[PDB]
Amino acid sequence: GFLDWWEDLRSEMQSITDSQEVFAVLEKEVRRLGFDYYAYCVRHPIPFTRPRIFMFGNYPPAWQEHYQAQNYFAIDPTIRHCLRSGNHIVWSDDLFADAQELWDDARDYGLRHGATHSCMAPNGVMGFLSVARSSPAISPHEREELRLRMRCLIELLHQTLTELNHPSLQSNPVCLSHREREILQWTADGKSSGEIAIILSISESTVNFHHKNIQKKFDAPNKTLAAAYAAALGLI
Amino acid sequence: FLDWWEDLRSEMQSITDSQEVFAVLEKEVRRLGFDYYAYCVRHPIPFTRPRIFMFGNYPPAWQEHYQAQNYFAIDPTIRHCLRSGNHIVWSDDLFADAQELWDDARDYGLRHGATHSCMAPNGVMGFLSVARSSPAISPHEREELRLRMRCLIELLHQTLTELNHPSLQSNPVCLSHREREILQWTADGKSSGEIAIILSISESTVNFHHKNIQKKFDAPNKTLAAAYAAALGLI
Ligand SMILES: O=C(CCCOc1cccc(Br)c1)N[C@H]1CCSC1=O
Ligand SMILES: O=C(CCCOc1cccc(Br)c1)N[C@H]1CCSC1=O
């Protein structure tokens, strides 16, 4: 029973105390769902041009090398920060219309049917979980139950890797003060350094002082990087 | 169980009226063992006064007592924060920094409940609450409640987007394939001049797309454009 599985998986997961044991249980659950291999990809929101991306999975090592050789992560439609209709998408030739060399290479290496689920933590980090198999296509009868079963896996995996303080989830910690924060919302809302100084009734000589410290907490050359990074991290 | 979720999907997909969706929702909140509910949409922008819509069948005395205290500003259950599981059961400790809200809430009979939040990638963060007075939420029904509520708010967000409700919609801003690359570099702290070197363009043309981006966001400077676009998932 789904709930018995959920409960038995939860008690089994909270019992884990190491980072390689969680992927072992995950591998056992992917086969339980009727699939052969999995893939977990964590995508941080910054830097906006080359975002930090971590990838773990038990795909065949031949594909793992081919994939890394072609930089397929740059054009993979299954790990793009998009708006999946249900945070979930079943692989189809339409999904890979703008990436035919990847879909052609994938089915060749035996990954002919699969699906990817995406969760977005409200701290910018997005998570992806893919499952793949060779012979049996995804039957419409098992589609929904697959969609629900994977949403529990990704969320559980996200929560337990967070509780274990995994590095792939730990982002650069930014200590923003309540006054510093309120200025940065005004900056990000388009107000100039002079305009800000009149609402808070402070000096322009001190709104730039706070800016100089916010930029130091983001290692920012300008305010733009600070305001944009803060918005992406949910810090404002 | 599964048979319930499957049967619930048929009722919603058949709905062709917004009020009919809230009606079916209310019937589900009763099935969970709760009297009242409340759904909330929190848009990310503006950063100083975000757009917030509120609906729910709370008692009328509370709704106009809630909105008369500006309680939406100090309510922990609608904070743009990272819940341990997109979920938190109400407790005296949860409302430590908002005691006037919790004391009034218990006085008015909203003594037991839980809130569940979903973060749509459009920057919108939806929240769903359920409340009752008599029976405390016992530890044995918690995890089953966390599951049933996650399904209820996901199907609620979707069903409401497929109906084009102007609570879920945000101001469109179609960004060009290159304007998006420029704003990404700008958002990464690069200057209008440095950007021209990376892409092999003229500073006048970098400063030319900027003028169009800030026009697409109604922005005074580049900082509003970069920050707004980052909040909406556009860069
Ligand atoms: O599963 C995913 C998620 C991103 C790629 O994940 C990978 C790929 C190769 C090695 C490793 Br490790 C992870 N994408 C699919 C698209 C079709 S083939 C494929 O890898
Ligand atoms: O659920 C929430 C916040 C979201 C709903 O807010 C409200 C409150 C009153 C009328 C309406 Br409509 C929405 N807060 C809880 C916790 C304390 S008592 C309460 O209403």
Residue numbers in the entry:
A (entry chain B): 6 to 241
B (entry chain A): 7 to 241
Paper text:
The majority of traits controlled by rhl transcription factor RhlR depend on PqsE, a dispensable thioesterase in Pseudomonas Quinolone Signal (PQS) biosynthesis that interferes with RhlR through an enigmatic mechanism likely involving direct interaction of both proteins. Here we show that PqsE and RhlR form a 2:2 protein complex that, together with RhlR agonist N-butanoyl-L-homoserine lactone (C4-HSL), solubilizes RhlR and thereby renders the otherwise insoluble transcription factor active.
Loss of interaction was also found for variant RhlR-P61, in which we back-mutated residues in the DNA-binding domain to the wildtype sequence to assess the RhlR-regulatory activity of the stabilized protein. We then used a RhlR-P61-encoding plasmid vector to transform a ΔpqsE/ΔrhlR/ΔrhlI triple mutant of P. aeruginosa PA14. Here, the production of pyocyanin was restored to wildtype levels and not significantly altered by C4-HSL or mBTL, demonstrating that the stabilized RhlR indeed acts independently of PqsE and of these ligands. Crystallization of RhlR-P61 with mBTL showed the ligand in a similar position and conformation as in the other crystal structures determined here.
